[PDB]
Amino acid sequence: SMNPPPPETSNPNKPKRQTNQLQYLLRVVLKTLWKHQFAWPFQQPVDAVKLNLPDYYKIIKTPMDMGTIKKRLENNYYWNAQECIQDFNTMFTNCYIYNKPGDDIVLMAEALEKLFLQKINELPTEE
Ligand SMILES: CC(=O)N1c2ccc(-c3ccc(NC(=O)CCCCCCC(=O)NO)cc3)cc2[C@H](NC(=O)OC(C)C)C[C@@H]1C
């Protein structure tokens, strides 16, 4: 029933870089999604205590949210763009797994994912 610790956003043992693709992911992709009217439920880890969803972290074993992604991008946690893209995809997939089709939260996630894919289709090549 309690919340787990959030995903790691800092780790001195993990290798990291700044790439042009990761810069794009922060400045274009994350910025575009963050200001969407339906972004707010995804801006921090799912608080299963607040929501009284004691099964959330039984069903969802790889939690992810945009607050964590924003911290990882700003803290230069990632090695490459695919690590970040996978985090976004995990966030969407978790929502589709836990919730029913046609739930409001699923409609919200689908709106964000549509924008995400438009922006990722436009991902620049590596410098
Ligand atoms: C992502 C996901 O799958 N879920 C989820 C996750 C988080 C929340 C959620 C998130 C945040 C809060 N409230 C707060 O953090 C307090 C501040 C609210 C926002 C203030 C405005 C702002 O700062 N905007 O940027 C409550 C539920 C609700 C749902 C979903 N519940 C629900 O009623 O979602 C509606 C938004 C449709 C259930 C589900 C488990």
Short mmCIF file of all heavy atoms in Angstrom, two decimals, residues 20-75:
data_model
loop_
_atom_site.label_atom_id
_atom_site.label_comp_id
_atom_site.label_asym_id
_atom_site.label_seq_id
_atom_site.Cartn_x
_atom_site.Cartn_y
_atom_site.Cartn_z
N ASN A 20 23.22 15.89 -28.63
CA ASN A 20 22.27 16.81 -29.25
C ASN A 20 20.84 16.25 -29.21
O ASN A 20 19.88 17.00 -29.12
CB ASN A 20 22.69 17.18 -30.69
CG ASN A 20 22.59 16.01 -31.66
OD1 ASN A 20 23.19 14.96 -31.43
ND2 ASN A 20 21.85 16.21 -32.74
N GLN A 21 20.71 14.92 -29.24
CA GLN A 21 19.40 14.28 -29.16
C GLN A 21 18.79 14.42 -27.76
O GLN A 21 17.60 14.69 -27.63
CB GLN A 21 19.50 12.81 -29.55
CG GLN A 21 19.91 12.61 -31.00
CD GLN A 21 19.90 11.15 -31.40
OE1 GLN A 21 20.17 10.28 -30.58
NE2 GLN A 21 19.58 10.88 -32.66
N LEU A 22 19.61 14.27 -26.73
CA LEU A 22 19.16 14.47 -25.35
C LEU A 22 18.79 15.93 -25.09
O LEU A 22 17.84 16.21 -24.36
CB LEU A 22 20.21 14.00 -24.34
CG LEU A 22 20.30 12.48 -24.20
CD1 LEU A 22 21.62 12.07 -23.54
CD2 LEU A 22 19.11 11.94 -23.41
N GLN A 23 19.53 16.86 -25.69
CA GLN A 23 19.19 18.28 -25.58
C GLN A 23 17.83 18.56 -26.23
O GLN A 23 17.02 19.29 -25.67
CB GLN A 23 20.29 19.14 -26.21
CG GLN A 23 21.57 19.17 -25.38
CD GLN A 23 22.69 20.00 -26.00
OE1 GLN A 23 22.66 20.32 -27.19
NE2 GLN A 23 23.68 20.35 -25.19
N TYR A 24 17.59 17.95 -27.38
CA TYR A 24 16.30 18.04 -28.05
C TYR A 24 15.18 17.47 -27.18
O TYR A 24 14.09 18.06 -27.09
CB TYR A 24 16.36 17.30 -29.39
CG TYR A 24 15.06 17.24 -30.16
CD1 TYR A 24 14.69 18.28 -31.01
CD2 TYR A 24 14.23 16.14 -30.06
CE1 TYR A 24 13.50 18.21 -31.73
CE2 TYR A 24 13.05 16.07 -30.78
CZ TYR A 24 12.69 17.10 -31.62
OH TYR A 24 11.51 17.03 -32.33
N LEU A 25 15.44 16.34 -26.54
CA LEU A 25 14.45 15.72 -25.67
C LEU A 25 14.05 16.62 -24.51
O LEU A 25 12.89 16.59 -24.08
CB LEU A 25 14.93 14.35 -25.17
CG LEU A 25 14.76 13.22 -26.18
CD1 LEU A 25 15.77 12.10 -25.94
CD2 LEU A 25 13.34 12.68 -26.15
N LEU A 26 14.97 17.43 -23.99
CA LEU A 26 14.63 18.35 -22.91
C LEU A 26 13.96 19.62 -23.45
O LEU A 26 12.93 20.03 -22.95
CB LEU A 26 15.86 18.73 -22.09
CG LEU A 26 15.62 19.72 -20.93
CD1 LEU A 26 14.55 19.23 -19.97
CD2 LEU A 26 16.93 19.96 -20.20
N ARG A 27 14.57 20.23 -24.46
CA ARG A 27 14.17 21.56 -24.89
C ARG A 27 12.95 21.58 -25.80
O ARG A 27 12.22 22.57 -25.83
CB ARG A 27 15.36 22.26 -25.55
CG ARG A 27 16.51 22.46 -24.57
CD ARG A 27 17.56 23.45 -25.03
NE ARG A 27 18.69 22.82 -25.71
CZ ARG A 27 19.94 23.30 -25.73
NH1 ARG A 27 20.25 24.43 -25.09
NH2 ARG A 27 20.89 22.65 -26.39
N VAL A 28 12.72 20.50 -26.54
CA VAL A 28 11.57 20.41 -27.43
C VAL A 28 10.53 19.41 -26.90
O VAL A 28 9.37 19.78 -26.70
CB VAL A 28 11.99 20.04 -28.87
CG1 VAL A 28 10.78 19.74 -29.73
CG2 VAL A 28 12.82 21.16 -29.48
N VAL A 29 10.93 18.17 -26.66
CA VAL A 29 9.96 17.12 -26.35
C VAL A 29 9.34 17.30 -24.96
O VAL A 29 8.13 17.45 -24.84
CB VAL A 29 10.56 15.71 -26.49
CG1 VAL A 29 9.52 14.65 -26.18
CG2 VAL A 29 11.12 15.51 -27.90
N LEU A 30 10.18 17.31 -23.93
CA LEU A 30 9.69 17.48 -22.55
C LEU A 30 8.95 18.80 -22.38
O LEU A 30 7.90 18.85 -21.75
CB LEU A 30 10.84 17.36 -21.55
CG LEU A 30 10.52 17.26 -20.05
CD1 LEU A 30 10.23 18.62 -19.43
CD2 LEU A 30 9.38 16.29 -19.78
N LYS A 31 9.49 19.88 -22.95
CA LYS A 31 8.84 21.19 -22.85
C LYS A 31 7.46 21.20 -23.50
O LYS A 31 6.51 21.75 -22.94
CB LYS A 31 9.71 22.29 -23.47
CG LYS A 31 11.05 22.50 -22.78
CD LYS A 31 10.93 23.04 -21.36
CE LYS A 31 12.26 22.99 -20.63
NZ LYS A 31 13.32 23.80 -21.31
N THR A 32 7.34 20.57 -24.67
CA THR A 32 6.05 20.47 -25.37
C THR A 32 5.02 19.71 -24.54
O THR A 32 3.89 20.16 -24.37
CB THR A 32 6.21 19.80 -26.75
OG1 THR A 32 6.97 20.65 -27.62
CG2 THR A 32 4.85 19.51 -27.39
N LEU A 33 5.41 18.56 -24.00
CA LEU A 33 4.47 17.75 -23.22
C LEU A 33 4.13 18.39 -21.87
O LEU A 33 2.98 18.33 -21.43
CB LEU A 33 5.01 16.32 -23.02
CG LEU A 33 4.69 15.30 -24.12
CD1 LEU A 33 5.33 15.62 -25.47
CD2 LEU A 33 5.13 13.91 -23.67
N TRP A 34 5.12 19.01 -21.23
CA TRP A 34 4.95 19.55 -19.88
C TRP A 34 3.87 20.58 -19.78
O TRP A 34 3.16 20.65 -18.77
CB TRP A 34 6.25 20.13 -19.35
CG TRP A 34 6.26 20.35 -17.86
CD1 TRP A 34 5.91 21.51 -17.16
CD2 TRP A 34 6.66 19.39 -16.83
NE1 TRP A 34 6.06 21.32 -15.81
CE2 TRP A 34 6.50 20.07 -15.55
CE3 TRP A 34 7.11 18.08 -16.85
CZ2 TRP A 34 6.80 19.45 -14.35
CZ3 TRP A 34 7.40 17.47 -15.64
CH2 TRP A 34 7.24 18.13 -14.42
N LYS A 35 3.72 21.40 -20.83
CA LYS A 35 2.75 22.50 -20.79
C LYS A 35 1.37 22.13 -21.36
O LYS A 35 0.46 22.96 -21.38
CB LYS A 35 3.31 23.74 -21.51
CG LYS A 35 3.53 23.59 -23.00
CD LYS A 35 4.20 24.83 -23.58
CE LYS A 35 4.44 24.68 -25.08
NZ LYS A 35 5.22 25.81 -25.64
N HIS A 36 1.20 20.89 -21.80
CA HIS A 36 -0.10 20.40 -22.25
C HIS A 36 -1.08 20.41 -21.09
O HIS A 36 -0.70 20.12 -19.96
CB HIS A 36 0.02 19.00 -22.83
CG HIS A 36 -1.19 18.56 -23.60
ND1 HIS A 36 -2.30 18.10 -23.01
CD2 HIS A 36 -1.43 18.55 -24.97
CE1 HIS A 36 -3.21 17.79 -23.95
NE2 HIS A 36 -2.68 18.07 -25.16
N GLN A 37 -2.33 20.74 -21.37
CA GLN A 37 -3.34 20.81 -20.31
C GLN A 37 -3.52 19.49 -19.54
O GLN A 37 -3.90 19.51 -18.38
CB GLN A 37 -4.69 21.31 -20.84
CG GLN A 37 -5.44 20.36 -21.76
CD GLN A 37 -6.91 20.74 -21.90
OE1 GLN A 37 -7.62 20.94 -20.90
NE2 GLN A 37 -7.37 20.84 -23.14
N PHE A 38 -3.22 18.36 -20.19
CA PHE A 38 -3.37 17.05 -19.55
C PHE A 38 -2.06 16.50 -18.97
O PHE A 38 -2.00 15.33 -18.59
CB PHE A 38 -3.93 16.03 -20.55
CG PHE A 38 -5.33 16.33 -21.04
CD1 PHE A 38 -5.74 15.87 -22.29
CD2 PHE A 38 -6.26 16.99 -20.25
CE1 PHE A 38 -7.02 16.11 -22.76
CE2 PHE A 38 -7.55 17.24 -20.71
CZ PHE A 38 -7.92 16.80 -21.96
N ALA A 39 -1.02 17.32 -18.87
CA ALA A 39 0.27 16.87 -18.35
C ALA A 39 0.29 16.61 -16.85
O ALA A 39 1.06 15.77 -16.38
CB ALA A 39 1.35 17.87 -18.70
N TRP A 40 -0.52 17.33 -16.08
CA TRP A 40 -0.34 17.36 -14.62
C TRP A 40 -0.36 16.02 -13.90
O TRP A 40 0.42 15.83 -12.97
CB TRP A 40 -1.25 18.40 -13.93
CG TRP A 40 -2.71 18.07 -14.02
CD1 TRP A 40 -3.62 18.48 -14.99
CD2 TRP A 40 -3.47 17.22 -13.11
NE1 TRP A 40 -4.86 17.96 -14.74
CE2 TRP A 40 -4.84 17.18 -13.63
CE3 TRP A 40 -3.17 16.50 -11.97
CZ2 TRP A 40 -5.84 16.45 -13.01
CZ3 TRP A 40 -4.19 15.77 -11.35
CH2 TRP A 40 -5.49 15.75 -11.85
N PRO A 41 -1.20 15.05 -14.32
CA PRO A 41 -1.14 13.78 -13.58
C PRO A 41 0.17 13.02 -13.77
O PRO A 41 0.48 12.14 -12.97
CB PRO A 41 -2.29 12.97 -14.18
CG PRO A 41 -3.19 13.99 -14.81
CD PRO A 41 -2.26 15.02 -15.35
N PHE A 42 0.93 13.37 -14.80
CA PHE A 42 2.15 12.68 -15.18
C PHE A 42 3.40 13.44 -14.74
O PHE A 42 4.51 13.00 -15.01
CB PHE A 42 2.16 12.48 -16.70
CG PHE A 42 0.96 11.74 -17.21
CD1 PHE A 42 -0.15 12.42 -17.69
CD2 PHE A 42 0.93 10.35 -17.18
CE1 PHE A 42 -1.27 11.74 -18.14
CE2 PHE A 42 -0.18 9.67 -17.63
CZ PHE A 42 -1.28 10.36 -18.11
N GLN A 43 3.24 14.55 -14.04
CA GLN A 43 4.38 15.42 -13.67
C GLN A 43 5.14 14.97 -12.42
O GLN A 43 6.10 15.63 -12.01
CB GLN A 43 3.92 16.87 -13.52
CG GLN A 43 3.68 17.55 -14.86
CD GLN A 43 3.06 18.92 -14.74
OE1 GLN A 43 2.56 19.30 -13.69
NE2 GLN A 43 3.05 19.67 -15.85
N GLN A 44 4.72 13.87 -11.80
CA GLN A 44 5.37 13.35 -10.60
C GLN A 44 5.00 11.88 -10.47
O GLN A 44 4.06 11.43 -11.10
CB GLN A 44 4.94 14.14 -9.37
CG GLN A 44 3.44 14.11 -9.08
CD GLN A 44 2.62 14.93 -10.04
OE1 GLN A 44 2.84 16.14 -10.17
NE2 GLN A 44 1.67 14.29 -10.72
N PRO A 45 5.75 11.12 -9.65
CA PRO A 45 5.39 9.71 -9.45
C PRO A 45 3.94 9.50 -9.01
O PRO A 45 3.40 10.33 -8.29
CB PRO A 45 6.36 9.27 -8.35
CG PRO A 45 7.56 10.14 -8.55
CD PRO A 45 7.00 11.48 -8.96
N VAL A 46 3.33 8.41 -9.45
CA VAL A 46 1.99 8.07 -9.01
C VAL A 46 1.98 7.92 -7.49
O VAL A 46 2.72 7.12 -6.94
CB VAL A 46 1.50 6.76 -9.67
CG1 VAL A 46 0.14 6.36 -9.11
CG2 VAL A 46 1.44 6.91 -11.18
N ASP A 47 1.15 8.70 -6.82
CA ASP A 47 1.02 8.64 -5.37
C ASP A 47 -0.17 7.74 -5.07
O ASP A 47 -1.32 8.19 -5.03
CB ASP A 47 0.84 10.04 -4.79
CG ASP A 47 0.84 10.05 -3.27
OD1 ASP A 47 0.56 9.00 -2.66
OD2 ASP A 47 1.08 11.13 -2.68
N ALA A 48 0.12 6.46 -4.90
CA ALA A 48 -0.90 5.44 -4.74
C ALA A 48 -1.58 5.53 -3.37
O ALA A 48 -2.69 5.01 -3.19
CB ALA A 48 -0.29 4.06 -4.96
N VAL A 49 -0.93 6.17 -2.41
CA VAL A 49 -1.54 6.42 -1.11
C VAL A 49 -2.62 7.51 -1.25
O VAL A 49 -3.77 7.32 -0.85
CB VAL A 49 -0.49 6.84 -0.07
CG1 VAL A 49 -1.16 7.22 1.24
CG2 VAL A 49 0.50 5.70 0.15
N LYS A 50 -2.25 8.63 -1.86
CA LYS A 50 -3.20 9.72 -2.12
C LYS A 50 -4.42 9.23 -2.91
O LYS A 50 -5.54 9.63 -2.63
CB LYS A 50 -2.49 10.84 -2.88
CG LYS A 50 -3.38 12.00 -3.30
CD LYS A 50 -2.64 13.00 -4.17
CE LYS A 50 -1.69 13.86 -3.33
NZ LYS A 50 -1.00 14.92 -4.10
N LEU A 51 -4.19 8.36 -3.89
CA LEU A 51 -5.25 7.85 -4.76
C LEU A 51 -6.00 6.65 -4.18
O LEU A 51 -6.98 6.19 -4.77
CB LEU A 51 -4.66 7.45 -6.11
CG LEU A 51 -4.18 8.62 -6.98
CD1 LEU A 51 -3.33 8.13 -8.14
CD2 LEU A 51 -5.38 9.42 -7.48
N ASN A 52 -5.53 6.13 -3.04
CA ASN A 52 -6.06 4.89 -2.46
C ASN A 52 -6.08 3.77 -3.49
O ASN A 52 -7.12 3.12 -3.71
CB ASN A 52 -7.46 5.10 -1.86
CG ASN A 52 -7.86 3.95 -0.93
OD1 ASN A 52 -7.01 3.26 -0.37
ND2 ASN A 52 -9.16 3.75 -0.77
N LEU A 53 -4.93 3.54 -4.12
CA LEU A 53 -4.77 2.47 -5.09
C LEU A 53 -3.67 1.55 -4.58
O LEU A 53 -2.55 1.58 -5.09
CB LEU A 53 -4.42 3.03 -6.46
CG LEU A 53 -5.48 3.93 -7.12
CD1 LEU A 53 -4.90 4.58 -8.37
CD2 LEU A 53 -6.75 3.15 -7.44
N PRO A 54 -3.98 0.72 -3.57
CA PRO A 54 -2.94 -0.08 -2.96
C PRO A 54 -2.37 -1.17 -3.85
O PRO A 54 -1.36 -1.78 -3.49
CB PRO A 54 -3.64 -0.70 -1.75
CG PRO A 54 -5.08 -0.74 -2.12
CD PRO A 54 -5.29 0.52 -2.92
N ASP A 55 -3.00 -1.43 -4.99
CA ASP A 55 -2.48 -2.36 -5.97
C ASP A 55 -1.60 -1.75 -7.06
O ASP A 55 -1.03 -2.50 -7.85
CB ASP A 55 -3.62 -3.13 -6.65
CG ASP A 55 -4.45 -2.27 -7.57
OD1 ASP A 55 -4.44 -1.03 -7.42
OD2 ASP A 55 -5.13 -2.85 -8.42
N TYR A 56 -1.48 -0.43 -7.12
CA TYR A 56 -0.80 0.19 -8.26
C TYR A 56 0.61 -0.37 -8.42
O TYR A 56 1.01 -0.77 -9.51
CB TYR A 56 -0.75 1.73 -8.16
CG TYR A 56 -0.12 2.31 -9.40
CD1 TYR A 56 -0.86 2.50 -10.57
CD2 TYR A 56 1.23 2.61 -9.43
CE1 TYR A 56 -0.27 2.99 -11.72
CE2 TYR A 56 1.83 3.10 -10.58
CZ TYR A 56 1.07 3.30 -11.72
OH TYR A 56 1.70 3.77 -12.85
N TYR A 57 1.37 -0.40 -7.33
CA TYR A 57 2.76 -0.85 -7.37
C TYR A 57 2.91 -2.37 -7.22
O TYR A 57 4.03 -2.87 -7.12
CB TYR A 57 3.59 -0.07 -6.35
CG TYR A 57 3.76 1.37 -6.76
CD1 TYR A 57 3.11 2.41 -6.09
CD2 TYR A 57 4.58 1.69 -7.83
CE1 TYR A 57 3.28 3.73 -6.49
CE2 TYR A 57 4.74 3.00 -8.23
CZ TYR A 57 4.10 4.01 -7.56
OH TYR A 57 4.30 5.31 -7.99
N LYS A 58 1.78 -3.08 -7.23
CA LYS A 58 1.78 -4.52 -7.49
C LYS A 58 1.65 -4.79 -8.99
O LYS A 58 2.32 -5.66 -9.54
CB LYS A 58 0.64 -5.20 -6.73
CG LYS A 58 0.92 -5.41 -5.25
CD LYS A 58 0.20 -4.41 -4.37
CE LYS A 58 0.19 -4.88 -2.92
NZ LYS A 58 -0.12 -3.79 -1.96
N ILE A 59 0.80 -4.02 -9.66
CA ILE A 59 0.56 -4.18 -11.10
C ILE A 59 1.68 -3.55 -11.94
O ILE A 59 2.10 -4.11 -12.96
CB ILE A 59 -0.81 -3.57 -11.48
CG1 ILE A 59 -1.92 -4.28 -10.71
CG2 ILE A 59 -1.03 -3.63 -12.98
CD1 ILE A 59 -3.32 -3.99 -11.19
N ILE A 60 2.17 -2.40 -11.48
CA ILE A 60 3.18 -1.64 -12.21
C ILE A 60 4.51 -1.75 -11.49
O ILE A 60 4.70 -1.18 -10.41
CB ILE A 60 2.75 -0.17 -12.37
CG1 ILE A 60 1.43 -0.08 -13.16
CG2 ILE A 60 3.86 0.66 -13.02
CD1 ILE A 60 1.48 -0.71 -14.54
N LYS A 61 5.42 -2.50 -12.08
CA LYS A 61 6.71 -2.78 -11.47
C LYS A 61 7.85 -1.91 -12.02
O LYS A 61 8.94 -1.92 -11.47
CB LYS A 61 7.05 -4.28 -11.62
CG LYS A 61 6.12 -5.22 -10.87
CD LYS A 61 5.88 -4.74 -9.45
CE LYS A 61 5.54 -5.86 -8.48
NZ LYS A 61 5.29 -5.30 -7.13
N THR A 62 7.60 -1.16 -13.08
CA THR A 62 8.59 -0.21 -13.60
C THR A 62 7.94 1.17 -13.72
O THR A 62 7.62 1.63 -14.82
CB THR A 62 9.19 -0.68 -14.94
OG1 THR A 62 8.17 -0.78 -15.93
CG2 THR A 62 9.86 -2.04 -14.77
N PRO A 63 7.73 1.83 -12.58
CA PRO A 63 7.06 3.13 -12.64
C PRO A 63 7.91 4.19 -13.32
O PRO A 63 9.14 4.14 -13.26
CB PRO A 63 6.81 3.50 -11.18
CG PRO A 63 7.59 2.54 -10.37
CD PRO A 63 8.00 1.38 -11.21
N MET A 64 7.25 5.13 -13.98
CA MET A 64 7.93 6.26 -14.57
C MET A 64 6.96 7.41 -14.73
O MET A 64 5.76 7.20 -14.90
CB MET A 64 8.53 5.88 -15.92
CG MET A 64 9.46 6.91 -16.55
SD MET A 64 10.77 7.55 -15.47
CE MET A 64 11.61 6.04 -15.00
N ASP A 65 7.49 8.62 -14.67
CA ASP A 65 6.68 9.82 -14.79
C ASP A 65 7.55 10.92 -15.39
O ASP A 65 8.78 10.80 -15.43
CB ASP A 65 6.21 10.25 -13.42
CG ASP A 65 7.36 10.61 -12.52
OD1 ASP A 65 8.01 9.68 -11.98
OD2 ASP A 65 7.65 11.82 -12.41
N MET A 66 6.91 12.00 -15.85
CA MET A 66 7.65 13.09 -16.49
C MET A 66 8.46 13.92 -15.52
O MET A 66 9.42 14.57 -15.93
CB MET A 66 6.72 14.01 -17.29
CG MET A 66 6.07 13.37 -18.50
SD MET A 66 5.58 14.56 -19.75
CE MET A 66 4.38 15.51 -18.82
N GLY A 67 8.08 13.94 -14.24
CA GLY A 67 8.88 14.64 -13.25
C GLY A 67 10.24 13.99 -13.13
O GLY A 67 11.28 14.67 -13.07
N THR A 68 10.25 12.66 -13.10
CA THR A 68 11.49 11.89 -13.05
C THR A 68 12.30 12.11 -14.32
O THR A 68 13.51 12.33 -14.25
CB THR A 68 11.20 10.39 -12.87
OG1 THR A 68 10.56 10.20 -11.60
CG2 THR A 68 12.47 9.55 -12.94
N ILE A 69 11.64 12.07 -15.48
CA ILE A 69 12.33 12.28 -16.76
C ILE A 69 12.95 13.68 -16.83
O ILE A 69 14.10 13.84 -17.24
CB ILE A 69 11.38 12.06 -17.95
CG1 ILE A 69 10.92 10.59 -18.01
CG2 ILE A 69 12.05 12.46 -19.26
CD1 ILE A 69 9.79 10.33 -18.98
N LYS A 70 12.18 14.69 -16.42
CA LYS A 70 12.69 16.08 -16.37
C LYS A 70 13.94 16.17 -15.49
O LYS A 70 14.94 16.76 -15.89
CB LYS A 70 11.59 17.02 -15.88
CG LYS A 70 12.01 18.49 -15.76
CD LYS A 70 10.82 19.35 -15.37
CE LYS A 70 11.14 20.84 -15.44
NZ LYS A 70 11.98 21.26 -14.29
N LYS A 71 13.90 15.58 -14.30
CA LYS A 71 15.08 15.56 -13.42
C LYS A 71 16.24 14.83 -14.08
O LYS A 71 17.38 15.28 -14.00
CB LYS A 71 14.77 14.88 -12.09
CG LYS A 71 13.90 15.68 -11.13
CD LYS A 71 13.62 14.86 -9.88
CE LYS A 71 12.61 15.53 -8.96
NZ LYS A 71 12.32 14.69 -7.76
N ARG A 72 15.97 13.69 -14.73
CA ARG A 72 17.05 12.94 -15.36
C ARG A 72 17.69 13.74 -16.49
O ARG A 72 18.91 13.75 -16.62
CB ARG A 72 16.56 11.58 -15.87
CG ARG A 72 16.30 10.59 -14.74
CD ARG A 72 15.74 9.29 -15.27
NE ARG A 72 15.73 8.29 -14.22
CZ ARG A 72 15.50 6.99 -14.40
NH1 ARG A 72 15.23 6.50 -15.60
NH2 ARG A 72 15.56 6.18 -13.36
N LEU A 73 16.88 14.43 -17.28
CA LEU A 73 17.41 15.28 -18.36
C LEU A 73 18.21 16.46 -17.80
O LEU A 73 19.33 16.73 -18.26
CB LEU A 73 16.27 15.77 -19.27
CG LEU A 73 15.66 14.71 -20.19
CD1 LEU A 73 14.35 15.20 -20.80
CD2 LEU A 73 16.64 14.30 -21.28
N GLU A 74 17.65 17.16 -16.82
CA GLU A 74 18.31 18.33 -16.22
C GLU A 74 19.56 17.97 -15.42
O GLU A 74 20.49 18.77 -15.34
CB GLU A 74 17.33 19.08 -15.32
CG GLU A 74 16.21 19.76 -16.09
CD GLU A 74 15.16 20.38 -15.19
OE1 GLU A 74 15.21 20.17 -13.96
OE2 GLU A 74 14.27 21.06 -15.73
N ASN A 75 19.59 16.78 -14.84
CA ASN A 75 20.74 16.29 -14.07
C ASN A 75 21.75 15.53 -14.93
O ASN A 75 22.73 15.00 -14.39
CB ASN A 75 20.29 15.34 -12.95
CG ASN A 75 19.44 16.03 -11.90
OD1 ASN A 75 19.31 17.25 -11.87
ND2 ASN A 75 18.84 15.22 -11.02
#
